[PDB]
Amino acid sequence: RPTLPIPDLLTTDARNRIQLTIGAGQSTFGGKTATTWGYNGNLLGPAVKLQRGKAVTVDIYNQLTEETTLHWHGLEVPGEVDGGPQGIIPPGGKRSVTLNVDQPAATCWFHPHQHGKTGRQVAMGLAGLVVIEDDEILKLMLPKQWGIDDVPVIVQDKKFSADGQIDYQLDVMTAAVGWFGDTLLTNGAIYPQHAAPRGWLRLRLLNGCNARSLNFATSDNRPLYVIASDGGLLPEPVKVSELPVLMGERFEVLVEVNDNKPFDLVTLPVSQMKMAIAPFDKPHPVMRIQPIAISASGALPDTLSSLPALPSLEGLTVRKLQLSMDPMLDMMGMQMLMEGGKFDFHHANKINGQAFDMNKPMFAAAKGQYERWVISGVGDMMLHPFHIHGTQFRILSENGKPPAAHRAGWKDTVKVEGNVSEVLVKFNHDAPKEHAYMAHCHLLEHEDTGMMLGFTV
Ligand SMILES: [Cu+2]
Ligand SMILES: [Cu+2]
Ligand SMILES: [Cu+2]
Ligand SMILES: [Cu+2]
Ligand SMILES: [Cu+2]
Ligand SMILES: [Cu+2]
Ligand SMILES: [Cu+2]
Secondary structure, three states: OOEOOOOOEEOOOOOOEEEEEEEEEEEEEOOEEEEEEEEOOOOEOOEEEEEOOOEEEEEEEEOOOOOEOOEEEOOOOOHHHHOOOOOOEOOOOEEEEEEEOOOOOEEEEEEOOOOOOHHHHHHOOOOEEEEEEOHHHHOOOOOOOEOOOEEEEEEEEEOEOOOOOEOOOOOOOHHHHOOOOOEEEEOOEEOOEEEEEEEEEEEEEEEOOOOOOEEEEEOOOOOEEEEEEOOEEEEEEEEEOOEEEOOOOEEEEEEEEOOOOOEEEEEOOOOOOOOOOOOOOOOEEEEEEEEEEEEOOOOOOOOOOOOOOOOOOOOOOEEEEEEEOOHHHHHHHHHHHHOOOOOOOOOOOEEOOEOOOOOOOOEEOOOOOOEEEEEEOOOOOOEEEEEEOOOOEEEEEEOOEOOOHHHOOEEOEEEEEOOEEEEEEOOOOOOOHHHOEEEEEOOHHHHHOOOEEEEEO
16 A cells, blocks of 8 residues: 655744645546646645744745635634635735634644635645644643654545546536545545554544545544544543544544554445445545554543633524525435436525625624524535634534534534534634635535625624
C-alpha cells in the first residue's frame, strides 16, 4: 500500500504571515491522471497551525481560472475574515485576512464557499485543515507528534470517469441526494498505510465528502477513544466501538497500538433511509495502521477538559428554522434509492420558505448571548447535517433526542434527518450585512441549491 500522505503543518513565517496558493494541478488515482485543485499543491492542502490568543495574517492567492472564497469552518471569527461579496477572490486576485483565535483547542478545516459552486470546488480537491492549540491541551501529554502519532485523516469519495478525470455534475439528481463516488480517498490516497509506534495513536478524523456519511471503526473491533469533537476536547474520553461522522464534522480519537498486530481503520455501511443492511453491504477499509517497535510517549488522561454547564433555557431567544426540499427532488431521490415542469432547481431547497439570497439576511442574532435554535426537517426524510458559522454550540436535542455523550460537547454541526434538532448558540463577534454569517446544510449540493440563510450579529 502507498504510505499515508501527511499535510504540511504550516506556522507563521518571520513576518507573521501564512501563504496559501489556490492552484490547479495534476494528481494520480489508481494509475490514471486527473486534474485536481489544491492549496499550496495539487490536492487538498496544508494544516494551518494556530495559537489561541494570538493573531496571524493569511495571504490567499487565487491562481485558478474562476472565482472562489475561503471559509474557515469552525473558527469563531468576525464575518469579515470569510467576507461576504468582499470575500470573493477573482482569478489572479489576492486577499488578506487577519485571524484572531480566541476559542479552545480544536481541529477545524477550511474549504471554498462560492455561491452555487461549493460542491464542485470541494469535489475538485480544495480542502485544508486548521489545528488550534491553547495552553490547556499542551499540558495533557496527548500524542502530539505530527505525522507520526498525531495524524490527520481526511476521508473523501470521488467519482472518476473512464478517462480518469473527476466527474462532477450539479444536475437535477445530485441536487437531491448529493454527489457520490465509488473511490474512497484518505488524504488523497487510495487505502494508504501509516506506520505508527507502539502506544497511543491519535487520529484527527474529517469527513470531507460532499454527501456521504461515514461510520468509523477498526477491523478487529478494538475501541476508539473519542477525545474531541468539532469544537474541541470533551470533558473525558468517550469510548466507542464505531463513530458516525457527518459531512464536515471532525472528531479526534485515540486508538491503541499495543502489538505488532496491524489493523485497518474502516468505515461501516450507513443506513440510507432508516433501512436494513444485507451482508453484501460490506465495511470498506480507510487506512492500514502498521505498528513499529518504537514506543510512543502519548497518554490518555482521565480528564481532558472542563466544559461549562448548559445555561438555563429561560430568557433565551428561540429562533425556528424549517428545512424543506422541492418535492420533485425528494421524490426522485427515493426512486433512485431502489433503482415535471419548467423547474429551476438552483433555488429549489429552502429554509423557512426562502431559498438563499446573498443580499437578504433572514435576521440578526444577539452578540454574546445564548440563543436557542430549533431546526426541523420534519417535512423531509433525508439527512441534513446543519452547520452554523461563527460559533461552537451545544446540542440540546439532536433529531429529537438528547445528544450522545461524545456529541454533547462543542459542535458546529447537528444532524437533522426527518425530525427536529435544538442547539444552544452564542456569537462573540460582529458580522454586518456585507459580511454576514451563514447557516446551512453541509450536504454541499443542498447548500448550492438554496438550503442556506445569512444572518447578522
Ligand atoms: Cu464547512
Ligand atoms: Cu467589510
Ligand atoms: Cu474572538
Ligand atoms: Cu460498498
Ligand atoms: Cu443564488
Ligand atoms: Cu440537506
Ligand atoms: Cu458554511
